[PDB]
Amino acid sequence: SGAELARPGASVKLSCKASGYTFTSYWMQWVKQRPGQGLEWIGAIYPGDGYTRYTQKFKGMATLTADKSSSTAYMQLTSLASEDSAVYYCARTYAGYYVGYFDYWGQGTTLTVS
């Protein structure tokens, strides 16, 4: 999804459309990168069964969900503050309950909170 401007205290929901593979067989990651900063893990979701894993830091901040019929993963960020202004990436780790590498990344969505 495209860049987004939201005000402090609000919430936003960004999407990631999958394509090129059997969506429901693969786990999706969400990653945060603040301006000039490194990468931070937000959490992961398994669209096939609805399972989620969250970095303790983001529990209560991020909500992951997915829509099988549209092969789309979503991430909702609530109670926004300027600390949430960052580029957010969605990424695929390959199929299974194993802990694989991140093999495909979205182009990223920039969130400005102000």
Binding site: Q29, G38, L39, W41, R53, Q56, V99, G100, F102
Partner: peptide, 16 residues
């Protein structure tokens, strides 16, 4: 360039 472990959770990234 970044390194990331994929051994158990949570996944963490190196500083780059």
């Amino acid at each position: 360039y970044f390194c990331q472990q994929h051994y158990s959770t949570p996944y963490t990234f190196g500083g780059g």
